[PDB]
Design goal:
This protein is an alpha+beta fold. It contains 9 helices and 26 strands. The protein has a domain at 112-286: 3-Layer(aba) Sandwich (Rossmann fold). The protein has a 6-stranded mixed β-sheet, with no helix packed on it. Strands 4, 6, 14, 15, 16 and 18 form a 6-stranded antiparallel β-sheet that branches. A 6-stranded mixed β-sheet has the order 9-8-7-10-11-12. This is Integrin beta-3.
């Protein structure tokens, strides 16, 4: 029964491989030509393609490093393992896919680098401005003794770092860092302020931590007066907080979406008062370090990725990259299936899977199986191949220019042989008046020095 195998008329083992992860290739070389060479193992060794002449590579998943997840004792000595596993390897058939999983458990407070970017709008009464400060102060005083880090930037016409991470680290006095805040009282260059934060505030030189989560809390009082884009803030989690009379229209609220992360139902917050700032952050602080989101890094372009997530209570979520609502000690899982396209070239590739804001991350290495191991012992210009007119790799010939066939004997490109019997007019008659050979369901006429042989059946012989 012809399968997806065979039916392709494949002409080498690699093609045979490239058709499908199942299909297998024979190379007995002593096998009669009429037998197909690309089927499946338990159906191409019945036919006597001598066992072990068959090449049947299999994609496989091996686990390389497998840290256990860290129990509550979190003495950060040689770190805590918050991801298991974090390095595996994968060998792949042509366009194949194989399952594997990953577990996440937060064994730490959670490191965040938080930048307040607060408005200095001339629309602000001194009291309204003071509440924003007290808000920031109140946020930070609740977050003493945490893994938190704070920087704050006032912005108006200008952008000024009022104190950065390193300053918060060595002082830890929200009142003495912000006692210096003088009110800018100019317009609202939100685009510039955001770019300024993304490049100048989030600097390792200024106490910023690399792996720590990048969160931005933008507190504005009106629509931005500048233009542009916030491309550089791409990787910063951006909360935007519009306040006051200028966000009554649902229209005016939409302009804050460009600045804030997505979804905007989560990251855009509108208030009408300034008294709601106290009760605001209390509600927002919970979902900050609640959820884990998977970061995919240095990923190959030819790698299909489908997903499958387990979260709170054995819940099956197919394709989820983030289980939310979590608390320290809680474990989750993710089922991943990785498909590839074609057989690419480097055959060794490293890419990283990380949860956002973590040092630990699943780095998976991947090689690709594609070429049959029988491509060595290739024997170019093989005698079994019309003698030097083709290369006999793996029990089979594939040919040089012009020549074609089993061995490269059908030099004349004359379509597929179809029924062999084409070489003779009727059942009993021998093939082509016995002065030719039937090649690819066609007759090449015998060459003698006495006469030249013509005609579809080599019948006609003109001589000299
Ligand atoms: C901070 O927490 C540590 C232990 O968690 C405690 O020893 C210390 O007194 C606390 N100090 C403040 C200011 O919260
Ligand atoms: C998700 O997982 C199920 C089994 O858990 C599997 O059958 C399915 O193919 C997976 N879906 C995707 C899109 O990876
Ligand atoms: Mg304003």
């Amino acid at each position: 029964g012809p399968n997806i195998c065979t039916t392709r008329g494949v002409s080498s083992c690699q093609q045979c491989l490239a058709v499908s992860p199942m299909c297998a290739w024979c190379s007995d070389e002593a096998l009669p030509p009429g037998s197909p060479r690309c089927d499946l193992k338990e159906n191409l060794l019945k036919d006597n393609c001598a066992p072990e002449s068959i090449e049947f590579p299999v994609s496989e998943a091996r686990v390389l490093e497998d840290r256990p997840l860290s129990d509550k004792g979190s003495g950060d000595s040689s770190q805590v393992t918050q991801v298991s596993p974090q390095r595996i390897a994968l060998r792949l058939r042509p366009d194949d896919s194989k399952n594997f999983s990953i577990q996440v458990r937060q064994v730490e407070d959670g490191n965040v680098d938080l930048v307040f970017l607060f408005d200095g709008s001339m629309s602000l009464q001194p009291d309204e401005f003071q509440k924003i400060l007290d808000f920031m102060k109140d946020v930070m005083k609740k977050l003493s003794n945490t893994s938190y880090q704070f920087a704050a930037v006032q912005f108006s016409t200008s952008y000024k770092t009022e104190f950065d991470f390193s300053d918060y680290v060595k002082w830890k006095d929200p009142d003495a860092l912000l006692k210096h805040v003088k009110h800018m009282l100019l317009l609202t260059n939100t685009f510039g302020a955001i770019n300024y934060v993304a490049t100048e505030v989030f600097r390792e030189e200024l106490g910023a931590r690399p792996d720590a989560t990048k969160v931005l809390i933008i507190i504005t009082d009106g629509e931005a007066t500048d233009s542009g884009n916030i491309d550089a803030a791409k990787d910063i989690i951006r909360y935007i907080i519009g306040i006051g009379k200028h966000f009554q229209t649902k229209e005016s609220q939409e302009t804050l979406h460009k600045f804030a992360s997505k979804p905007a139902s989560e990251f855009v917050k509108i208030l009408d008062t300034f008294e709601k700032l106290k009760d605001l952050f209390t509600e927002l602080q919970k979902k900050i370090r609640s959820k884990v989101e998977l970061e995919v890094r240095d990923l190959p372009e030819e790698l299909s990725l489908s997903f499958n997530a387990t979260c709170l209570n054995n819940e099956v979520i197919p394709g989820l990259k983030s289980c939310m609502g979590l608390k320290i000690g809680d474990t989750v899982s993710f089922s991943i299936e990785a498909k590839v396209r074609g057989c690419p070239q480097e055959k060794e590739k490293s890419f990283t899977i990380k949860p956002v804001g973590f040092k630990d991350s699943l780095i998976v290495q991947v090689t690709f199986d594609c070429d049959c191991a029988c491509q060595a012992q290739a024997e170019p210009n093989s005698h079994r191949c019309n003698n030097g007119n083709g290369t006999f790799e793996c029990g089979v010939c594939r040919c040089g220019p012009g020549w074609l066939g089993s061995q490269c004997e059908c030099s004349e490109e004359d379509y597929r042989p179809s029924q062999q019997d084409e070489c003779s007019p009727r059942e009993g008659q021998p093939v082509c008046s016995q002065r030719g050979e039937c090649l690819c369901g066609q007759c090449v006429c015998h060459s003698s020095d006495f006469g030249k042989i013509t005609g579809k059946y080599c019948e006609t012989r003109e001589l000299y």
